[PDB]
Design an enzyme around this catalytic site. Structure first.
Site, PDB file in Angstrom:
ATOM      1  CB  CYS A  41      -1.126   0.326   1.171  1.00 42.97           C
ATOM      2  SG  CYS A  41      -2.313  -0.892   1.157  1.00 42.97           S
ATOM      3  CB  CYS A  84       1.559   6.148   2.901  1.00 45.43           C
ATOM      4  SG  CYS A  84       0.148   4.529   3.447  1.00 45.43           S
ATOM      5  CG  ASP A 107     -11.648  39.928 -26.350  1.00 44.23           C
ATOM      6  OD1 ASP A 107     -11.965  39.238 -26.808  1.00 44.23           O
ATOM      7  OD2 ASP A 107     -11.513  40.667 -25.247  1.00 44.23           O
ATOM      8  CB  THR A 132     -11.336  45.827 -26.845  1.00 42.37           C
ATOM      9  OG1 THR A 132     -11.407  45.278 -27.780  1.00 42.37           O
ATOM     10  CG2 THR A 132     -12.626  46.651 -26.123  1.00 42.37           C
ATOM     11  CG  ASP A 152     -12.512  41.378 -21.439  1.00 44.09           C
ATOM     12  OD1 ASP A 152     -13.321  41.311 -22.893  1.00 44.09           O
ATOM     13  OD2 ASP A 152     -13.369  42.931 -21.609  1.00 44.09           O
ATOM     14  CG  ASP A 212       4.464   4.880   2.810  1.00 41.44           C
ATOM     15  OD1 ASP A 212       4.595   5.208   1.571  1.00 41.44           O
ATOM     16  OD2 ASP A 212       3.494   3.435   2.635  1.00 41.44           O
TER      17      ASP A 212
HETATM   18  F1  ALF Z   1     -12.969  40.456 -29.599  1.00 43.10           F
HETATM   19 AL1  ALF Z   1     -12.985  41.456 -28.055  1.00 43.10          AL
HETATM   20  F2  ALF Z   1     -12.994  42.485 -26.673  1.00 43.10           F
HETATM   21  F3  ALF Z   1     -11.712  42.321 -28.904  1.00 43.10           F
HETATM   22  F4  ALF Z   1     -14.182  40.375 -26.870  1.00 43.10           F
HETATM   23 MG   LIG Z   2     -13.476  41.101 -24.676  1.00 45.43          MG
END
Ligand code: ALF
Ligand SMILES: [Mg+2]
Length: 603
Positions: free
Chosen positions: A265, A267, A309, A311, A501, A587
């Site tokens: 076993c 451990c 992303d 923005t 975001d 162990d």
């Molecule tokens: F595509 Al984006 F913020 F630039 F959602």
């Molecule tokens: Mg965005």
């Protein structure tokens, strides 16, 4: 809710007390130990038993239960209790490292306002039928995909594009559900069936992405699948071979075999991976990171690509004036104070940017009279007697700013014209600018061999400016499905982290090995993601990826330790120079070691 910890505590108390009964009247105490062993062994035995039914014969639970049952017949009750305790600690540590679509549901309104016979009626969103005329108030979300009946309107379609810049739409143009009517009150012909809107399609993308996620198998099960049937076979052999070939005692070799089952076993190994992850998640939390569950930390560990992303993620998500180019006879501050004089009060983010720029420069904004929208051109007001219009560059003759306007626009800028009495008084450039630490963060990712790519729903030019600044490639003008496709394509090549975001990032996030949300991001983003940059510092990404990786190293060390000592004390045992209690002690030492090692992640 916390009854998960109970077996641990009860096992502890029952143990210590059993010892207390080995302090007066031993034989009565051994029964108490058998009680401890059995009560701790119960969930593990039935759990294993269910696994045997489901085809899986040799999970670690099997080894554990068999070894305990064997240790019962040979009065190794204290030891079996000990190993059960260690196992329970591993199980619980693992359990605490577990992750605990409402935010997207809040995007669909509950009621809509339908128009029939010149009468308004508040109806359930699912009562809406294609062809119905619905009316969305200012600031209200579209309950369904609609075709604009109104002559003209602007919409915030950020839930699909990530861009809050209002989109000009005219009669016949399709407006997607979740869009926001920014200034006016609109009427639309419903186009989508109930449950078939743009928001609904987003939801479907998220669910599908989550369903296509393959569960990763623990190391311990892949291991147990070979180790467990192995040490069972050997223990059978150390039982059979000696009395059948050396005419030795059946009792002592049966005993010895079962002892080998208990010794086998591992451990330390069960606490090996959980100890690291618990430390890692605790270290990340301490320095402005947020990770939901250990699987997220492991995926973070094996990542080599990032899709950003634009923005709100790479950029602050707000327009900012970048240049002011007045006509001759006019100063930049005059053009600016005039534009600000017109734009004051307007909600359009460009207007807000202009007013802001006027304010930081301590330029007193004069009162405007007769302020109004000049529909389909721009916004107009009269300042100190004269009518001045501020409008988009494609809405009015450039004359003598043409080249400059083209230069600005190709460089990813947005231009507005200031016009008084049909004279172009000058232009103003605005741009969504990079976050302070975007550049250095990207460079650091590149130092770690992690390449970035940009997936944005923004226009090719605005994207190309930013991606130009960061030396990254990009795909632009993307809808959520397109992001999901791009992310899939990339993730087949190598594990990818998606940082966003926005609502429209949500399906991509689930399609990636791990989704990561910005702190200021949409609720949908923060809820869909497996992790969160609670500070909006992009540098805190590299840290994460660093920590995760270190964690992945720590584990590999720990296992070795746990798997090394074991091996040693396996072979020595098989040579007959080491016994059960020594292997248990060893162990335990191994466990202390992997623990101490796991604590190094906190530094
Ligand atoms: F595509 Al984006 F913020 F630039 F959602
Ligand atoms: Mg965005």
């Amino acid at each position: 809710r916390l009854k998960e910890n109970l077996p641990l505590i009860t096992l502890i108390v029952m143990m210590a007390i059993s010892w207390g009964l080995e302090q007066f009247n031993h034989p009565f105490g051994q029964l108490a130990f058998i009680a401890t062993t059995l009560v701790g062994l119960y969930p593990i035995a039935r759990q294993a038993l269910r696994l045997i039914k489901s085809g899986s014969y040799f999970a670690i639970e099997t080894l554990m239960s068999v070894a305990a049952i064997g240790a019962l017949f040979i009065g190794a009750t204290a030891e079996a209790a000990m190993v059960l305790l260690l196992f329970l600690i591993g199980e619980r540590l693992e359990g605490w490292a577990a992750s605990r679509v409402s935010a997207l549901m809040a995007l669909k309104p509950e009621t809509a306002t339908r128009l029939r016979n010149g009468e308004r009626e508040e109806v359930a969103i699912n009562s809406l039928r294609p062809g119905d005329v619905i009316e969305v108030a200012a600031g209200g979300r579209l309950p369904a995909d609609g075709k604009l009946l109104s002559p003209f309107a602007s919409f915030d379609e950020s839930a699909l594009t990530g861009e809050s810049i209002p989109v000009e739409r005219a009669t016949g143009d399709k407006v997607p559900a979740g869009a926001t009517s920014v200034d006016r009150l609109v009427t639309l012909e419903v186009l989508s069936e109930p449950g078939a809107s743009a928001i609904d399609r987003i939801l479907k993308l998220i669910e599908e992405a989550e369903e296509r996620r393959a569960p990763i198998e623990r190391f311990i099960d892949r291991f147990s699948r070979i180790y467990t049937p192995a040490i069972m076979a050997v223990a059978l052999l150390v039982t059979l071979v000696p009395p059948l070939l050396f005419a030795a005692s059946w009792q002592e070799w049966i005993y010895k075999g079962l002892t080998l089952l208990l010794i086998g076993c591992p451990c330390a190994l069960v606490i090996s991976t959980p100890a690291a992850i618990t430390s890692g998640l605790a270290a990340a939390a301490r320095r402005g990171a947020l990770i939901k569950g250990g699987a997220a930390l492991e995926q973070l560990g094996r990542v080599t690509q990032v899709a950003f992303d634009k923005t709100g993620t790479l950029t602050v998500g707000k327009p900012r004036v970048t240049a002011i180019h007045p006509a001759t006879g006019i100063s930049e501050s005059e053009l600016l104070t005039l534009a600000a004089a017109v734009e004051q009060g307007a909600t359009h983010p460009l207007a807000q940017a202009i007013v802001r720029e006027a304010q930081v420069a301590e330029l007193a904004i004069p009162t405007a009279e007769s302020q109004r929208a000049l529909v389909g051109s721009g916004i107009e007001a009269q300042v100190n007697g004269e009518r001045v219009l501020i409008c988009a560059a494609g809405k009015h003759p450039a004359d003598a700013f043409a080249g400059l306007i083209n230069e600005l626009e190709s460089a990813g800028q947005t231009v507005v014209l200031v016009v008084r009495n049909d004279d172009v008084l000058g232009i103003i450039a605005l741009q969504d600018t990079l976050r302070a630490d975007a550049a250095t963060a990207i460079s650091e990712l590149n130092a770690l061999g992690v390449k970035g790519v940009i997936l944005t729903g923004d226009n090719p030019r605005a994207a190309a400016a930013i991606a130009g600044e960061l030396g990254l490639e990009f795909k632009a003008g993307l809808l959520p499905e397109d992001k999901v496709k791009a992310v899939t394509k990339l993730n087949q090549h190598a594990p990818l982290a998606m940082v966003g975001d926005g609502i429209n990032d949500a399906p991509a996030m689930k399609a990636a090995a791990i989704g990561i949300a910005m702190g200021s991001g949409t609720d949908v983003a923060l809820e869909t993601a497996d992790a969160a940059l609670t500070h909006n510092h992009l540098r805190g990404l590299v840290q994460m990826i660093e920590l995760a990786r270190a964690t992945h190293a720590n584990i590999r060390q720990n296992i070795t330790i746990a798997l090394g000592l074991k091996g040693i004390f396996l072979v020595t045992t098989l040579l007959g120079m080491t016994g059960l209690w020594l292997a248990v002690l060893a162990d335990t030492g191994a466990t202390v070691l992997v623990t101490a090692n796991a604590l190094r992640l906190l530094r």
